[PDB]
Amino acid sequence: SGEKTLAVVSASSDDRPSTRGIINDNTYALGVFRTTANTYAPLYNVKHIYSGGEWGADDVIKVDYRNASFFAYYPYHTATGNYAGLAGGTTLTLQAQLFNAGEDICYGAGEASGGGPVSVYNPFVEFLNMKHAYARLRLTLTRGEKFDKTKKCNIQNITFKSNNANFYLTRSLDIASTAGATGGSAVAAGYVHNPNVNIATGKSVTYEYMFPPQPLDGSKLTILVTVDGVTRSCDISTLGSSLDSGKYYGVSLTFTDVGIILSSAVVTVNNF
């Protein structure tokens, strides 16, 4: 026999302040792909489930003398909606939305256990150091001590724009590429989230978002908030020149009697 059954050994993510480390949970599955590199027939979104210290599949994948190129993403999704491009391809859609752990995709190339290529001579692949695709942002809105006591502090139409011009609502991600988020079209209306909530005296509300990584023109993120019917605009120039997948962004807005106290934060990993 010139072929052996492939074994998916491990999967891990090393980017971002809070790392996934080696994935050892059942909760989510791993979607496995094989490209046409070295004349192999392509494999798309093969669902692998963590069982018996490895990632098992209902299907059998074979590797012969040819060196095989594998890619994986996590958490696995059925190839529909924003994941329709994974049915017979390696592209998925990243969409600006409220944070959802199930959508917080990481992806990467597979390599042979102990390095070298994956073939019948070493039919073991690992998906280590997968990178996250989305940029996370936490927005806190606080009713300041000096905010007008007669007003409701009603919050509507939280709007995100690069340089008060536009924002990418959706972008593409090729899980067989290292480009990260690419393509898409920047929308002039920006990303709009309308919670329509009243912030009571001394209280705060926090929203968690996930956005496709994208440039911040002139290093500016504009946030528009309609406070008790009045449209307010905040320019944030201290988040860097782009929203990046490996970083956690924080914006805090405190509404006072005369303005907004703006607190911006960037969390990153600097490894030795």
> Where do contacts with a copy of itself occur on this chain (CB under 8 A)?
17, 232, 234-235, 237-240, 250, 254, 256, 258-272
DSSP state of 166: B
Cβ(13)–Cβ(20) below 8 Å: yes
Q: Which is nearer to a copy of itself, 208 or 235 (CB)?
A: 235
Q: Which is nearer to a copy of itself, 13 or 93 (CB)?
A: 13
CB of 102 to a copy of itself, least distance (A): 25
Q: Which is nearer to a copy of itself, 100 or 241 (CB)?
A: 241
Single-letter amino acid code for the residue at 2: G
Supply φ then ψ for residue 84, to 5 degrees.
-60, -35
Q: Which is nearer to a copy of itself, 17 or 81 (CB)?
A: 17
* CA end-to-end distance (rounded Å), the chain: 45
Residues 6+ apart with CB under 8 A from 156: 194, 195, 196, 225, 226, 229
CB of 12 to a copy of itself, least distance (A): 13
CB of 241 to a copy of itself, least distance (A): 8
Q: Which is nearer to a copy of itself, 16 or 34 (CB)?
A: 16
Q: Which is nearer to a copy of itself, 99 or 248 (CB)?
A: 248
CB of 224 to a copy of itself, least distance (A): 12
Q: Nearest Cα to 44, choosing from 13, 15, 78, 94?
A: 78
d(CA 235, CA 258): 17
115 torsion bin: left (phi>0), alpha (psi -120 to 50), beta (else):
left
Task: Collapse the DSSP code of 7 into the 3-class scheme (helix H, G, I; strand E, B; otherwise coil) and give the result.
Answer: strand
Cβ(198)–Cβ(57) below 8 Å: no
CB of 22 to a copy of itself, least distance (A): 13
CB of 192 to a copy of itself, least distance (A): 20
